[PDB]
């Protein structure tokens, strides 16, 4: 399996620069007087015309031969001093190269995180491998449990494994040099996240989820979820239930062994755990549990999917849920949408999920405001059926 | 043209519509955790393609650079 | 009005129709665009540089220089 | 402190500073004062006047 | 920061630095900037122009 490592990197301290005080008014008067003298002298050389005067009038005022050095006293008397520029430009360049070294370190870290996440969370299309890496996740609360109950739902941002230590000793905002300050702002802004990684939902932290948006968006995501669980988790660890009013949309699930009821047998094999109503629960085995405590492992973790739109769920489903079972409310209703942290809302036609920001590690909500979460890995019925025809080939 | 040979990289920056950052001259706020969200490119066939994601508006730098080269 | 030259007429109507139109274009463009800090210094210094000539030119209009040369 | 009592030069500059800061608060509606174009352009005026004076002297020397 | 708002000279040099660094990133494909021939040769251009100006003045003094 791949490797990933956290790091901590302190950002460098921006440059400081003293703001120019501005020249006093008499200096301007003196400058104008000096120019007046210079033009008066040369003018009287032109008016006098003799080559002796034309020599003398240039020979005596040659002072720049020393004044090029005496510029150093500009910083003593307070004249204009543009000449510190080269040193500052060198400092800028140096700082920028240091920042580049940090950026490439962030790049390699983000590449490692990407390789790891996509190894754990392949895209739905790629799940047709169906062997070798299939069903390899494990019940037991160590190791694989970090990804046992978690499902890739989309792609989006995440915080890197590098941690940006504070740029200590920040100069005050009048001393702060514009370039290095702005560059560091942009670094902190954009190296804050890795873009287009797999976005994950943990099944172990919410009693249910409710899917609000357009019907085919919601369905496509649901098929993707189902096939992700079916590839990643074996039928002995995760069992599946679909409760529907439109079984034609769900006819593909018959091939998937996770929908097989081990208790009832028919001609085709195990009974399909697809019901046309919540009243059609003739199981009563997933409905003798207690309320659910979010994990911080049941024998199968039942996943019950509903798009029946029936008021009768609120009887067998309290405000807290059932122990070994997580739910997915298709066709979002006020019964299931009573917890915004559970609502995955397709805000944009492409399938942009918004929900609450959750911690990468604990999956716990970090703040209550709804925000961009993912673009959903929506999958077609044909691809789902094709994967199901692959998964039906296996019985281990 | 002898001057223009020296000014040709600068003009090719300027015509390509690359613009260097504004400077926070007096706003005195330097921390902004706005984390710009992905622009997302829908595949032109549409049907059954999960749409792709690029990191920000800054993806237009990749276009502007190739334009700057062509100007130069 | 004082001069009867058609060239003066053409220049006058041209400046009357262009200069406020240029002001309109400046009002539409400038608040939306970015600008380079260098150009912003030129647009500052334009002010001081158009300020400075006016007193010498004024003294030229009074012919103070010619009076002080002669008187 | 009524009347025509004496004042130190540090108070003269302190008042002129408060006058400029109040002028900037009057024409603009910001008082962040790290740079101030008012001074810069009155210096440009001073340059205009001193240049006119200089040329007037340069005119005096002819006879 | 839209519009024609004021800017400090430290921002003027900061922008000119980012302009040179972007120009070097454009003509060459390296941004290690410890030395930069672009500046050196535009200084050579400046030397050419200032020498032409100087000789033009030295030509003016003849009559």
Helix (H) or strand (E) holding C47: helix C37-51
Nearest residue in chain A measured CA to CA from D41: A25
- Rounded to whole angstroms, the Cα distance separating A373 from A154 reads 9
> Between the CA of residue A339 and those of A23, A329, A355, what are the distances in Å?
64, 12, 11
Other chains touching E, judged by 3 or more CB pairs under 8 Å = A, B, C, D
Axis crossing angle, helix A85-120 with helix E9-27, rounded to the nearest 10? 60
Q: How close A311 comes to chain E (CA, Å)?
A: 55
| Beta pairing class for A194-202 and A150-158 | antiparallel
| Beta pairing class for A352-355 and A343-348 | antiparallel
B68 inside 8 A of chain E by CB: yes
Q: What is the DSSP letter of E21?
A: H
Residue B17 in contact with residue B64, Cβ under 8 Å?
yes
The CB density around residue E2, as the number of other CB atoms within 10 Å, is: 11
Burial degree of B67 (CB within 10 A; 0-12, 13-18, 19+)? middle
Residue E7 in contact with residue D36, Cβ under 8 Å?
no
Contacts of B48 (CB under 8 A, 6+ apart): A378, A379, A380, A382, A383
Dihedral sign, Cα of residue B21, residue B27, residue B33, residue B38: negative
Burial degree of D17 (CB within 10 A; 0-12, 13-18, 19+)? exposed
Contacts of A307 (CB under 8 A, 6+ apart): A218, A243, A244, A245, A246, A330, A331
Contacts of A2 (CB under 8 A, 6+ apart): A112, A115, A116, A119
Q: What are phi and psi of A260, to 5 degrees?
A: -75, 125
Burial degree of A112 (CB within 10 A; 0-12, 13-18, 19+)? middle
| Beta pairing class for A352-355 and A371-376 | antiparallel
Question: What is the domain range of residue E9?
Answer: 1-63
| Coil/strand/helix, residue A300 | coil
Structure-block tokens of residue A221: 């995501």
Q: How many CA atoms lie within 13 A of A309 on its CB side?
A: 8
| Beta pairing class for A162-165 and A150-158 | unpaired
Burial degree of A308 (CB within 10 A; 0-12, 13-18, 19+)? buried
Instruction: Give the mutation candidate from D41, D42, D50, D55 for the C interface (greatest C CB count, under 10 A).
Output: D55
Number of domains comprising chain E:
1
Query: E3 and C33 in contact by Cβ < 8 A?
Result: yes
| Coil/strand/helix, residue D7 | coil
Residue B50 in contact with residue A376, Cβ under 8 Å?
yes
- Rounded to whole angstroms, the Cα distance separating C66 from C61 reads 10
Encode E23-56: b = buried (16+ Cβ within 10 Å), e = exposed.
bbbbeeeeeebeeeebeeeeeeeeeeeeeeeeee
Query: A28 and D58 in contact by Cβ < 8 A?
Result: no
**Residue of B30, B50, B53 lying closest to A195 (CB–CB):** B53
Structure-block tokens of residue A289: 């549990």
| Coil/strand/helix, residue B62 | helix
Closest-CA residue to B49 (of A379, A199, A200):
A379
Closest-CA residue to A149 (of A302, A347, A336):
A302
| Beta pairing class for A343-348 and A208-212 | parallel
Closest-CA residue to B20 (of A14, E23, A95, E32):
E23
**What string of H, E and C letters represents the secondary structure of A148-201?**
HCEEEEEEEEECCCEEEECCCCCCCCCCECHHHHHHHHHHHHHCCCEEEEEEEE
Dihedral sign, Cα of residue A55, residue A27, residue A66, residue E43: negative
- Rounded to whole angstroms, the Cα distance separating A345 from A370 reads 10
- Rounded to whole angstroms, the Cα distance separating C29 from E3 reads 9
Query: A179 and E9 in contact by Cβ < 8 A?
Result: no
Strand residues in chain A grouped as ranges (E): 7-10, 150-158, 162-165, 194-202, 208-212, 240-244, 260-266, 269-272, 274-275, 302-307, 325-329, 343-348, 352-355, 371-376
User: Which chain D residues contact residue C69 at CB under 8 A?
Assistant: 59, 62
Q: What is the DSSP letter of A358?
A: B
User: Which chain D residues contact residue A32 at CB under 8 A?
Assistant: 47, 50-51, 54
- Rounded to whole angstroms, the Cα distance separating E18 from E5 reads 20
In whole angstroms, what separates CA A159 from the centre of its chain?
A: 6
- Rounded to whole angstroms, the Cα distance separating A294 from A288 reads 18
Residue A344 in contact with residue A212, Cβ under 8 Å?
yes
B10 inside 8 A of chain C by CB: no
Q: What is the DSSP letter of A318?
A: -
Other chains touching A, judged by 3 or more CB pairs under 8 Å = B, D, E
- Rounded to whole angstroms, the Cα distance separating D48 from D53 reads 9
Contacts of A26 (CB under 8 A, 6+ apart): none
User: Which chain E residues contact residue B71 at CB under 8 A?
Assistant: none
Residue that has been written with the tokens 């990191």 in this structure: B55
- Rounded to whole angstroms, the Cα distance separating A349 from A374 reads 13
- Rounded to whole angstroms, the Cα distance separating A193 from A239 reads 35
Encode A128-156: b = buried (16+ Cβ within 10 Å), e = exposed.
bebeeebbebbbeeeeebebbbbbbbbbb
- Rounded to whole angstroms, the Cα distance separating A290 from A300 reads 16
Residue A156 in contact with residue A196, Cβ under 8 Å?
yes
Contacts of A166 (CB under 8 A, 6+ apart): A10, A11
Structure-block tokens of residue C64: 């103070």
Residue A263 forms beta bridges with which residues? none
Query: B30 and A185 in contact by Cβ < 8 A?
Result: yes
Residue that has been written with the tokens 């139109």 in this structure: C21
Q: What are phi and psi of A336, to 5 degrees?
A: -90, -25
Structure-block tokens of residue A240: 């599946």
Residue A369 in contact with residue B44, Cβ under 8 Å?
no
Q: How close D47 comes to chain E (CA, Å)?
A: 21
Residue B53 forms beta bridges with which residues? B40
- Rounded to whole angstroms, the Cα distance separating A246 from A330 reads 12
Closest-CA residue to E38 (of E22, E51, E52, E53):
E22
User: Which chain B residues contact residue E6 at CB under 8 A?
Assistant: 25
Closest-CA residue to A308 (of A284, A339, A330):
A330
- Can you give the C-alpha Rg of chain A in angstroms? 35
Helix (H) or strand (E) holding A91: helix A85-120
Terminus-to-terminus CA distance in chain C, angstroms?
37
Helix (H) or strand (E) holding A228: helix A215-232
User: Which chain D residues contact residue A44 at CB under 8 A?
Assistant: 61
Residue that has been written with the tokens 């130190």 in this structure: D8
Closest-CA residue to A317 (of A391, A174, A210, A220):
A210
Helix spans in chain D (H): 9-27, 37-60
Encode A63-86: b = buried (16+ Cβ within 10 Å), e = exposed.
eeeeeeeeeeeeeeeeeeeeeeee
The CB density around residue D4, as the number of other CB atoms within 10 Å, is: 5
This structure's resolution (Å) is: 3.4
- Can you give the C-alpha Rg of chain E in angstroms? 18
The CB density around residue B51, as the number of other CB atoms within 10 Å, is: 20
> Between the CA of residue B9 and those of B65, E25, E38, what are the distances in Å?
12, 10, 10
Q: How close A168 comes to chain E (CA, Å)?
A: 22
**Residue of D35, D42, D46 lying closest to A29 (CB–CB):** D46
Q: How close D38 comes to chain E (CA, Å)?
A: 12
């Amino acid at each position: 399996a791949p490797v990933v490592k956290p790091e901590n990197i302190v950002l460098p301290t921006p440059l400081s620069v003293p703001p120019p005080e501005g020249k006093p008014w008499w200096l301007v008067v003196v400058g104008v007087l000096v120019v007046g003298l210079l033009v008066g002298m040369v003018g009287m050389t032109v008016a006098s015309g003799s080559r002796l005067f034309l020599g003398a009038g240039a020979i005596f005022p040659i002072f720049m031969i020393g004044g090029v050095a005496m510029m150093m006293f500009g910083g003593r008397f307070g004249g204009q001093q543009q000449m510190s520029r080269p040193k500052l430009d060198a400092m800028r360049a140096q700082f920028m190269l240091m920042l580049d070294m940090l950026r490439e370190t962030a790049q390699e870290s983000a590449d490692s995180m990407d390789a790891n996440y996509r190894w754990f969370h392949p895209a739905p299309t790629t799940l047709a491998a169906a062997v070798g890496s299939s069903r390899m996740w494990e019940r037991q609360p160590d190791g694989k449990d970090l990804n046992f109950g978690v499902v890739r739902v989309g792609v989006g941002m995440t915080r890197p494994e590098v941690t940006w230590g504070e740029p200590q000793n920040m100069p005050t905002d009048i001393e702060l040099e514009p370039v290095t300050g702005k560059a560091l702002q942009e670094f902190g802004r954009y190296q804050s996240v890795v873009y287009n990684l797999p976005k994950m939902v943990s099944l172990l932290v919410e009693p249910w989820y409710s899917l609000v948006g357009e019907r085919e968006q919601v369905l496509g995501l649901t098929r993707a979820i189902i096939c992700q669980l079916a590839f990643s988790h074996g039928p002995d660890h995760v069992q599946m239930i679909v409760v529907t009013s439109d079984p034609d949309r769900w006819d593909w699930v018959k091939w998937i062994p996770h929908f097989g009821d081990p208790r009832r047998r028919d001609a085709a094999g195990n009974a399909r755990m697809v019901y046309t109503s919540v009243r059609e629960f003739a199981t009563e085995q997933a409905e003798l549990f207690a309320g659910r405590g979010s994990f911080t492992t049941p024998t199968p973790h039942h996943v019950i999917i509903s798009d029946i739109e029936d008021p009768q769920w609120e009887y067998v489903i309290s405000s807290e849920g059932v122990d070994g079972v997580t739910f997915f409310d298709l066709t979002g209703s006020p019964l299931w949408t009573g917890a915004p942290q559970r609502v995955l809302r397709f805000t944009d036609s492409a399938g942009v999920i918004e929900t609450l920001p959750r911690d990468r590690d604990t999956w716990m909500v970090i703040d209550d405001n709804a925000w961009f979460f993912a673009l959903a890995d929506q999958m077609s019925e044909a691809d789902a059926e094709q994967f199901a025809h692959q998964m039906a080939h296996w019985r281990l | 043209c002898v001057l223009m040979y020296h000014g040709a990289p600068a003009l090719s920056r300027w015509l390509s519509g690359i613009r260097l950052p504004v400077f926070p001259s007096a706003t005195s706020r330097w921390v902004f955790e706005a984390r710009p969200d992905l622009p997302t490119t829908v595949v032109v066939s549409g049907g059954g393609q999960p749409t792709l994601e690029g990191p920000a508006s800054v993806r237009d730098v990749l276009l502007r650079a190739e334009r700057a080269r062509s100007f130069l | 009005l004082v001069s009867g030259s058609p060239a003066v007429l053409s220049a006058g109507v041209a400046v009357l129709v262009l200069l406020p139109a240029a002001g309109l274009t400046a009002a539409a463009v400038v608040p939306n665009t970015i600008y380079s800090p260098l150009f912003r210094k030129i647009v500052e210094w334009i002010e001081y540089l158009c300020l400075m000539p006016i007193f010498p030119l004024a003294l030229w209009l009074m012919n103070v220089y010619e009076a002080i040369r002669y008187r | 402190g009524y009347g025509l009592g004496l004042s130190t030069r540090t108070q003269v500059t302190g008042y002129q500073f408060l006058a400029r800061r109040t002028a900037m608060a009057l024409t603009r509606w910001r008082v962040r004062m790290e740079v101030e174009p008012g001074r810069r352009q009155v210096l440009a005026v001073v340059a205009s006047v001193s240049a006119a004076g200089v040329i007037c002297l340069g005119a005096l020397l002819w006879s």
